[PDB]
C-alpha cells in the first residue's frame, strides 16, 4: 500500500477532500466526486486544475491523475466546473443540483464581467439572485440595507452608473418584491433562462489573427464556431454551424475550418500558441459531441430522470 495522495476538489458551493491512490485515473476521481454530490448529468462538467507553468487545464479522465502536470502541492487543487453549456436550460438541466451549480457558475461569470450584461438585465438578474438567497421579501425580515453585504451587480455597471448602494438596493428590492411567493429552484432557473439568452453566454473566446494579421475573436460554442471583430465580441461577423462543417484542423499555429459545401472557401486563422490551438479543438469535439447527443433519442438513463422531476414539483 503506497503513500496516499490528497486532493481538494471544490464545486461552486462545496469543498471535498479525499486521498487517492497513485494510479487513480481522472475518470475514477471524477466519479467519486460526482457520486459524493449526487450529480448525474455529468456530461457538462470536468475537473479544472493548474499545471506547473500555471496554465489552467482540464483534467483528462483517461489518464492517471498523477501523470498530468498537475501543479504539485498538498492537497492538489481542482475546480469542479461546467465545461459545456446546454442549448436550452429548461430542457437539459433536470436535477436541481445540476441547476444550482450552473446557476452559481453563470452568476459568477455575470458578476465577474465575463458575460457582458446591460444594466437593466443585471438588476433583473440580481432580483432573481436575492429571491433565491433570501426567499420571499418581508418588510420585517429585510429592513433597509439587507442587500449591503451582497455582491449583486457586475462591476462594469457599477462603474457605468454611480448610484449608491442604497440607490441600487431600491431598484433590486422593488423587483425582489415582485417575486413574492416564488420558489428557490424556480428563481435560479428563472435566472438562467434570462442569462442563456445573452450574447456571450456559453461562448469560449480566443484571440486570433487571420491571414493578414488582423486581430480577431474565435467563439467556440454549443452550436458551432464564430469569428468576431476585436471591438465587438457580441455579434459575430462569420458564423459556422456544426451543420455546415466538413472538419476542423490545425498545424503549429495555422488553424483551418473546411466547409461541407466545396463552394464556400476555407476559413483560416492563426492562434498564439500550440497549447491554445489544442484547447480550441478540444472544445469543438466536446461541444459537437453534445450537439449530436441531444439530437439523439433520450438514452434509457436520461429517460426517467425527467419523470422523477415531474414528481418533485
Amino acid at each position: 500500500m503506497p503513500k496516499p495522495i490528497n486532493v481538494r476538489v471544490t464545486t461552486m458551493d462545496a469543498e471535498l477532500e479525499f486521498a487517492i491512490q497513485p494510479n487513480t485515473t481522472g475518470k475514477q476521481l471524477f466519479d467519486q466526486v460526482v457520486k459524493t454530490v449526487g450529480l448525474r448529468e455529468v456530461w457538462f462538467f470536468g475537473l479544472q486544475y493548474v499545471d506547473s507553468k500555471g496554465y489552467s487545464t482540464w483534467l483528462k479522465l483517461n489518464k492517471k491523475v498523477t501523470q498530468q502536470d498537475v501543479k504539485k502541492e498538498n492537497p492538489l487543487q481542482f475546480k469542479f466546473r461546467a465545461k459545456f453549456f446546454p442549448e436550452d436550460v429548461s430542457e437539459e438541466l433536470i436535477q436541481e443540483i445540476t441547476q444550482r451549480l450552473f446557476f452559481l457558475q453563470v452568476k459568477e461569470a455575470i458578476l465577474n464581467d465575463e458575460i457582458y450584461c446591460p444594466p437593466e438585465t443585471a438588476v433583473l438578474l440580481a432580483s432573481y439572485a436575492v429571491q433565491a438567497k433570501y426567499g420571499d421579501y418581508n418588510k420585517e425580515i429585510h429592513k433597509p440595507g439587507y442587500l449591503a453585504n451582497d455582491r449583486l451587480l457586475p462591476q462594469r455597471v457599477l462603474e457605468q452608473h454611480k448610484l449608491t448602494k442604497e440607490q441600487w438596493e431600491e431598484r433590486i428590492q422593488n423587483w425582489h418584491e415582485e417575486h413574492r411567493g416564488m420558489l428557490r429552484e424556480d428563481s435560479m432557473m428563472e435566472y438562467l433562462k434570462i442569462a442563456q439568452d445573452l450574447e456571450m453566454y456559453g461562448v469560449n473566446y480566443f484571440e486570433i489573427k487571420n491571414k493578414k494579421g488582423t486581430e480577431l475573436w474565435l467563439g467556440v460554442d454549443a452550436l458551432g464556431l464564430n469569428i468576431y471583430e476585436h471591438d465587438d465580441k457580441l455579434t459575430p461577423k462569420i458564423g459556422f454551424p456544426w451543420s455546415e462543417i466538413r472538419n476542423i484542423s490545425f498545424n503549429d499555429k495555422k488553424f483551418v475550418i473546411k466547409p461541407i459545401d466545396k463552394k464556400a472557401p476555407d476559413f483560416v486563422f492563426y492562434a498564439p500558441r500550440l497549447r491554445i490551438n489544442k484547447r480550441i479543438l478540444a472544445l469543438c469535439m466536446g461541444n459537437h459531441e453534445l450537439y449530436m447527443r441531444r439530437r439523439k433519442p433520450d438514452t434509457i438513463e436520461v429517460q426517467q430522470m425527467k419523470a422523477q422531476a415531474r414528481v418533485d414539483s
Partner: peptide, 16 residues
C-alpha cells in the same frame, strides 16, 4: 513534443 504536426477532427464522419 519539440516539433509540430497536424491534428484534425471531422465534424462530418465518413458515414461509418
Amino acid at each position: 513534443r519539440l516539433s509540430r504536426k497536424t491534428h484534425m477532427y471531422p465534424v462530418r464522419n465518413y458515414s461509418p
